[PDB]
Amino acid sequence: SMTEYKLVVVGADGVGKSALTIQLIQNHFVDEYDPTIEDSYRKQVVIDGETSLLDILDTAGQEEYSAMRDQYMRTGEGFLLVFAINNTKSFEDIHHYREQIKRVKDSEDVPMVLVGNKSDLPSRTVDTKQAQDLARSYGIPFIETSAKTRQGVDDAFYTLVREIRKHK
Template identity: 35%
Template sequence: MREQYMRTGDGFLIVYSVTDKASFEHVDRFHQLILRVKDRESFPMILVANKVDLMHLRKITREQGKEMATKHNNHRTSGSSPSPVLWGAITPYHHMLSKCHYLIYHLTKRLCELLSTTCYFRAHKIPYIETSAKDPPLNVDKAFHDLVRVIRQQIPEKSQKKKKKTKWRGDRATGTHKLQCVIL
């Protein structure tokens, strides 16, 4: 089921709890799995640090996140969400948003501990966002919007690779040439 989401997803959020170092345990594995399923060297992904409203329980510091994002030239934002972890594919945005809280709650303990956030995200250049869904919610929607931006940045790169050769129509009598085009 997980790989099926990966095949159809246009982008991915990898979310961990800042209050649980064990949530870092599987980030690398999920990242590699996404790249393997997509058969690509890079793909739109965002790392989301969740539960930033629980400062007294925090084990992953904001400085670690900033350092990680700076070294990768990534965007970094702060926020908070009621549930600890979400790792999911964004197929249609609204569909994923409706399942967000379920995924966040049930996947908390499955993500990542053994990896140093600094080394991992330096190597993979993944944007980093901190969220909290506690009232008032902080950056929950922004995480999804940022992922859409990352996905859209990939689209021009794909279209440049698939560019067709330009067809020219020439008027031999006058020596003028016109580009054949269609307006949709």
Template identity: 55%
Template sequence: KYDATIEDVYKKTVEIDGKQYSLEILDTAGTEEFSAMRDLYVKNGHGFVLVYSITSQATFNDLDEFYDRIIRIKDIEIHGQPALVLVGNKSDLED
């Protein structure tokens, strides 16, 4: 049986051009149950990966809400536009 992600955090240090960077990925199911924790990660984050299922139009439509939340929390008037990446997953399930 498939068990949907509730929340997982992945941490890795990477070196690029001789400089160390800390990478943290917060993987959530997108439920409101963890919205406070997610908001804290957004506040402290510098870049974001928004993932949707290409087999579900609803998950793509939900991205507007996540994007608006990121923009609101990051206050782009002060900090500028954060780096964003859009990823469509589950291509192996597409008919």
């Protein structure tokens, strides 16, 4: 029976966590803003020839409830660290998310992928090199995405599965 991977999508509010996940699951793009409480999804995929079951937790970006992330971080196996390439604050927020995951899991070695979303917009404030340099300093992959065009959507989730496989 196929292996199950517990993926968790985290990042500041409005960066496109839900748009990315719904693109993966439903193959369409939500242009409206429906702020998340918490949602979970399942999808089977084939990655590197091996069929895998993705269990995706789409989390809230509200800073107000930062204290309540610990339980889903304990449970999750791999994390998409999502920022938006036109939102320098959400890029700055990445550090806090990663440090929080490391603390809660008490490990330097947690599967993660840095995701720079909204690559379709012209208003970029975070240079790709900055993001790439940050990913390299974390030792994790960096994927540029657009939930609107689907660019990189599969790649971001599949790369995270690959990171979990290497870890196990």
